[PDB]
Amino acid sequence: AWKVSVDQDTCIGDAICASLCPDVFEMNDEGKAQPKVEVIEDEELYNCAKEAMEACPVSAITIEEA
Amino acid sequence: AWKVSVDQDTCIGDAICASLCPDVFEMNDEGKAQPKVEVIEDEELYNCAKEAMEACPVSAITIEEA
Ligand code: F3S
Ligand code: F3S
Ligand SMILES: [Co+3]
Ligand SMILES: [Co+3]
Ligand SMILES: [Co+3]
Ligand SMILES: [Co+3]
Numbered sequence: 001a002w003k004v005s006v007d008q009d010t011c012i013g014d015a016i017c018a019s020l021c022p023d024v025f026e027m028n029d030e031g032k033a034q035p036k037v038e039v040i041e042d043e044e045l046y047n048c049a050k051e052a053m054e055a056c057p058v059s060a061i062t063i064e065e066a
Numbered sequence: 067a068w069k070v071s072v073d074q075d076t077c078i079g080d081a082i083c084a085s086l087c088p089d090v091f092e093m094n095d096e097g098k099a100q101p102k103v104e105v106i107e108d109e110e111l112y113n114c115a116k117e118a119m120e121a122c123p124v125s126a127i128t129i130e131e132a
Pocket of ligand 6: 120121122123125
């Protein structure tokens with residue numbers, strides 16, 4: 001499966017990630033992105049998550065595969 | 067780009083990873099696997115690293131992308 005993470009230091013609350021993939025990303029109290037789930041198994045959620053990772057203007061998103 | 071890592075605690079020195087992807091994995095002095103590279107850009111190397119990750123008997127290998 002997959003695992004998504006957002007570097008809370010890099011993120012600038014652009015929110016383009018939560019826009020493209022609202023099922024995977026959400027805004028926290030610090031006004032930064034944050035993974036919605038701790039695991040992605042569905043191939044479509046993986047597709048928009050990777051779509052978000054590609055869109056983040058500060059490259060705060062990474063995706064791990066196990 | 068991709069980044070490979072081996073959990074030093076999980077690894078049991080099966081070495082099937084270095085067998086399949088000898089350009090990515092090597093054995094360290096502690097008898098455990100260790101990525102000999104810090105970044106994979108090439109897709110050929112990416113494939114055998116994903117080949118090894120699925121072959122490792124204790125799931126000590128993970129691949130992250132950015
Ligand atoms: S800046 Fe933060 S809010 Fe989303 S688009 Fe990049 S991870
Ligand atoms: S046990 Fe260690 S040596 Fe390779 S096959 Fe798994 S990472
Ligand atoms: Co909220
Ligand atoms: Co970019
Ligand atoms: Co040596
Ligand atoms: Co397995």
